[PDB]
Design a protein around this ligand. Structure first.
Ligand SMILES: [Zn+2]
Lengths: 32, 287, 298, 181
């Protein structure tokens, strides 16, 4: 289980980072 | 062999000829004819819009001069491009858009002579703030009384672009005529050159707005911000703490907490930054 | 499967052809659907009677076709024939399309059933009947090569009107979906070069079907070479899905083409490239795709 | 919501009367009730026998179940594009066809921790060991709570744990029960 979780924590980290960019990206563009 | 959902292709210079002619005689119901090209069954285009010499009658079939138009159309065959009329227009400054008592008759005379002849209504006294209420319409026959009007078949854009308001469905919608959607034929070789000649300044982007009135503007704003700060002081020290969340929501002012507090403060901050940075750059450049 | 059955032939030999081509798997599925059935009739009546003189006959006949897909039962085209034939111009088109949807898969029985409605003998002045018929024959005979691709080929070579050139090419493209035959590819090109602005969505959908996941070196160029100088929006939208459907799962082999469609100022082509980047990326957690897909959304 | 019962999620009958309320109302849009009449046909598609899935049996993806749904997304611009959604209709049968024609009628059951679900009955209002034959549907979520017959000698070769098609490793003599309508 110690190898199976470690990629899963990467996938949750990578899925988070595209989101938190995009919500910073949208809220920059939402001001117009 | 029936309509589904037509789309009117107007050009950029078409609407510009519409507003200037509509603004020209506002209290005299300007009247002209619309010239385009039927390209297929249910898309229609119009690029070139000319005006008609008006009369004492006003918007009617009698103000449409036949001998002037054919003299005009013949002279347009050699210069530019020859094509056939596809409709007409008039202006209703007194109200919104609906087909008047004689507008429906001259519609019948045009769709009996030409094919379908879409009529455009532009309100010049309304096209003021940032928007125009231009709308075009098209007559349906009175023979389809047992079938539902607007024979839509394979489309779902009809819920868009306008819904029929209360001021529209009272006169003739939908039992006499129907509404039509109009999009804007935008392209290159028109759009960027309109922006670069209207909203563009070369020498103005590096001026200095000399500091007689500039630092003077940084003084009338400090005083009213101070009084708002003292008023902001007055509310923050006050702090009603009997039922706070209901007292806060039934007593809002929309000017005390952060409305008038950082609005002018932001404006004075950005202005001197732009002014000093433009002042520093010219000192870097000019020797 | 088309590759191995060419390598296989290079009795138990005839048995292993049929189970690697697939006739009985259609049949036992067809046997499964004709046995088991649960469709209530009352609800369809309570939806039927609340329909006014609007356009909702197409909405009904698309609904029953969805809930009788493969059931192969004709009851609504039998109990009220006059109510179905009330509306026109596409309601006869959609219903005879829906007749094929209920008979999803016979591979012979629908061909001998719909042999009654010939495309020269139904009505001389109703091409929506024969056009929806050739559309319906393409729905039933899908992913099944043979004479039917060639038999629908001979009918498109001699077409009467442009209504029939819709459901003919839509029927032919779905029959040849994933085949990449040169003959259907040659006639679908010259159909697009006919320059007719009612059938571009008929040709544009069909060209993506016969070239589904193909990455041709000339199809994408000829489609994006055609959809610049035209003058309609259907012809933009027909080729829009076709250049999206031509690639499927390339995963790095469209990235310049995705950039080529998105940098363009064409709103349809920017819309079309969003489908193409979606179809090349399926089940794939590419962060850079969804970064680029969301940044262009807002 | 496809082949789902009340024990699967409670909002089904909530949504069925909601579909009904917007389709029996007169003062609505046609575009509103077009969504409801479409919701009627998708909820009961194929008589609770077919379902939609981009996913195949063994991790592979379908091509025609993707082509069907994406042209269905273009239903604003052309209404007969909705016919193409039928390609994504996938069966939920489990047929134990061992020979090219031999369809024996093997009576297998399942083992549900609650009581019965899985193929409701039509309305008209103006144990957990139920045996099942080979041409019978199965809910795609009860594929792991089933059980092949251990009291019968006829046992399959592939382990029955996922809906699809399997064979019956015939072991006895004197085979019978063939039926085709
Ligand atoms: Zn008027």
């Amino acid at each position: 289980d110690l190898y199976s979780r470690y990629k899963k924590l990467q996938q949750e980290l990578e899925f988070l980072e595209v989101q938190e960019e995009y919500i910073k990206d949208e809220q920059k563009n939402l001001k117009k | 062999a029936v309509d589904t959902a037509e789309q009117v292709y107007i050009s950029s210079l078409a609407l510009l000829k519409m507003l200037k002619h509509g603004r020209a005689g506002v209290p005299m119901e300007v009247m002209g004819l619309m010239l385009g090209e039927f390209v297929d069954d249910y898309t229609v285009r119009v690029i070139d819009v000319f005006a008609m010499p008006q009369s004492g009658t006003g918007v009617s079939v009698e103000a449409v001069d036949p001998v002037f138009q054919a003299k005009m159309l013949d002279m347009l065959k050699q210069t530019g491009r020859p094509e056939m009329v596809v409709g007409w227009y008039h202006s209703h400054p007194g109200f919104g858009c609906w087909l008047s008592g004689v507008d429906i008759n001259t519609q019948q005379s045009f769709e009996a002579l030409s094919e379908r002849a879409v009529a455009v209504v532009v309100d010049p006294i309304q096209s003021v703030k940032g928007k125009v209420v231009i709308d075009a319409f098209r007559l349906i026959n009175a023979n389809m009384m047992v079938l539902g009007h607007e024979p839509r078949q394979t489309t779902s854009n009809l819920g868009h672009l306008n819904k029929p308001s209360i001021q529209a469905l009272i006169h003739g919608l939908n039992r006499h005529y129907y509404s039509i959607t109009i999009n804007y034929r935008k392209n290159e070789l028109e759009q960027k050159m309109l922006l670069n000649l209207h909203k563009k300044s070369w020498m103005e982007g590096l001026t200095l707005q000399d500091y007689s009135e500039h630092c003077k503007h940084n003084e009338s704003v400090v005083k009213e911000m101070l009084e708002l700060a003292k008023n902001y002081n007055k509310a923050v020290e006050e702090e009603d703490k009997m039922t706070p969340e209901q007292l806060a929501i039934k007593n809002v002012g929309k000017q005390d907490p952060k409305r008038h507090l950082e609005e002018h403060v932001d404006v004075l901050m950005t202005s001197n930054i732009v002014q000093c940075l433009a002042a520093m750059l010219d000192t870097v450049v000019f020797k | 499967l088309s590759s191995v059955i060419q390598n296989l032939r290079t009795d138990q030999t005839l048995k292993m052809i049929k189970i690697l081509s697939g006739e009985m798997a259609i049949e036992l599925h067809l046997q499964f659907l004709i046995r088991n059935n649960n469709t209530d009739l009352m609800i369809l009546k309570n939806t039927k009677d609340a329909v006014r003189n609007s356009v909702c006959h197409t909405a009904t006949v698309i609904a029953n076709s969805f809930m009788h897909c493969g059931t192969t039962s004709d009851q609504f085209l039998r109990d009220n024939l006059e109510w179905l034939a009330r509306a026109t111009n596409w309601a006869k088109f959609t219903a005879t399309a829906s007749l094929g949807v209920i008979h999803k898969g016979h591979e012979k029985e629908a061909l001998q059933l719909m042999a009654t409605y010939l495309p020269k003998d139904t009505s001389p002045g109703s091409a929506y009947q024969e056009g929806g018929g050739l559309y319906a024959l393409g729905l039933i005979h899908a992913n099944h090569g043979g004479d039917i691709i060639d038999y629908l080929l001979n009918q498109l070579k001699n077409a009467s009107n442009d209504i029939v050139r819709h459901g003919g090419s839509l029927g032919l493209g779905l029959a040849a979906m994933g085949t990449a035959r040169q003959d259907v590819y040659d006639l679908l090109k010259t159909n697009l070069y006919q320059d007719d602005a009612v059938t571009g969505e008929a040709a544009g959908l069909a060209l993506g079907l016969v070239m589904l996941g193909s990455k041709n070196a000339q199809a994408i160029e000829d489609m994006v070479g055609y959809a610049q100088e035209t003058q309609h929006e259907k012809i933009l939208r027909g080729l829009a899905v076709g250049i999206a459907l031509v690639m499927y799962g390339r995963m790095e082999e469209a990235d310049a083409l995705i950039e080529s469609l998105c940098r363009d100022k064409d709103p349809i082509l920017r819309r079309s490239g969003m489908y193409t980047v979606a179809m090349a990326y399926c089940g794939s957690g590419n962060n850079k795709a969804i970064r680029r897909l969301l940044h262009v959304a807002v | 919501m496809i082949q789902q019962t009340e024990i699967t999620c409670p909002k089904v009958n909530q949504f069925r009367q909601l579909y009904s309320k917007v389709i029996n109302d007169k003062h609505d849009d046609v575009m509103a009730k077009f969504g409801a009449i479409l919701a009627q046909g998708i909820l009961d598609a194929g008589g609770h026998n077919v379902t939609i899935s981009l996913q195949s049996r063994t991790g592979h993806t379908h091509m025609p179940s993707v082509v069907g749904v994406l042209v269905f997304t273009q239903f604003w611009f052309w209404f007969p594009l909705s016919h193409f959604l039928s390609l994504a209709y996938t069966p939920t049968c489990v047929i134990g066809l061992n020979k090219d024609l031999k369809m024996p009628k093997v009576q297998y059951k399942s083992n549900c921790k609650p009581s019965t679900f899985a193929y409701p009955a039509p309305l008209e209002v103006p144990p957990n060991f139920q045996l099942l034959d080979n041409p019978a549907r199965v809910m795609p979520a009860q594929l792991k709570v089933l059980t092949m017959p251990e009291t019968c000698r006829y046992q399959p070769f592939k382990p029955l744990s996922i809906g699809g098609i399997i064979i019956l490793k015939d072991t006895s003599e004197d085979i019978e029960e063939l039926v085709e309508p």
